[PDB]
Structure 1
């Protein structure tokens, strides 16, 4: 198990424009296109991201390319963020993947806002952190995925993904 397989499990794969859990136009492996209600706006973003006129449909290869870029972007977001980097640096490789997963789903700024959870993680108070992480819109809106990610933080194993 690794961060790419983990996020593939959590995000799936769809090759035509769809709406994510929040109603936002998305494609591929959880690639957010726009928060605009305009499908045309979403298609413009997609064409820009891929570099061709797609009319809302892409290939698996193209989806995996956006995914590589998005995982890269999540890691670089963590490393450039003054709140996330020390926590990332303090973690083991499995819990690092859990943090990348969160940033992939809700963005650098959103995760950096989890101040009390981040502190408990840096303190390696895993059960406490797990409890704190669940007191969130994140958990309430996507509880099964949040549960997997939280279990990964709690145990430092891949148990929730096998």
Structure 2
């Protein structure tokens, strides 16, 4: 298991524009296209992202390339953020995947100051409790539980 397998499980794969859990136009392996309610706006974002006129549909290869880019962008958002980088560097490799997963889902900016401190301190049970007191956990509880279990245990048990 690695960050790609983990997020592929959490996000699935759809080759036609769909709506995510917040109602936002998305494609591929959880690639957000736009928060605008306009499908035409989403289709324009898609064509720009892929480099061809897609008509709202992509190939598996294109979805996987977008996914690589998106995982890379999440890692970079961590490494460029003065609050996130020190915590990320303090984690082992499995827990680093949980961190990337959260940034992929909610963005580098997207209130976890106290959870970050507990993670840096390696207070895993306390961090797990604090992470669940969130809109994130309430709105996507099964995915949040898998990510939190990864932070709590440092194992892939929730995914296996």
User: TM class by shorter-chain length?
Assistant: over 0.9
CA offsets 1:42-64 (integer angstroms, 9 cap, x no match): 00000000000001000000000
In structure 2, what is the Cα distance between the partners aligned to 1:88 and 1:123? 12
Q: How far apart are residue 156 of structure 1 and its match?
A: 0.3
Alignment root-mean-square deviation, CA? 0.4
In structure 2, what is the Cα distance between the partners aligned to 1:31 and 1:83? 25
Which residue number in structure 2 is paired with residue 154 of structure 1?
152
- Number of equivalent positions: 160
**Normalised TM-score (structure 1):** 0.98
CA offsets 1:45-104 (integer angstroms, 9 cap, x no match): 000000000010000000001000000000011000011000000000000000000000
In structure 2, what is the Cα distance between the partners aligned to 1:114 and 1:38? 31
In structure 2, what is the Cα distance between the partners aligned to 1:138 and 1:90? 23
Which residue number in structure 1 is paired with residue 48 of structure 2?
48
Q: How far apart are residue 144 of structure 1 and its match?
A: 0.1
Q: How far apart are residue 127 of structure 1 and its match?
A: 0.1
Q: How far apart are residue 4 of structure 1 and its match?
A: 0.2
1:62 aligns with 2:66: no
Give the secondary structure class of the aligned counterpart of 1:161: coil
Any stretches of 5+ residues in structure 2 without a counterpart?
none
Give the secondary structure class of the aligned counterpart of 2:63: helix
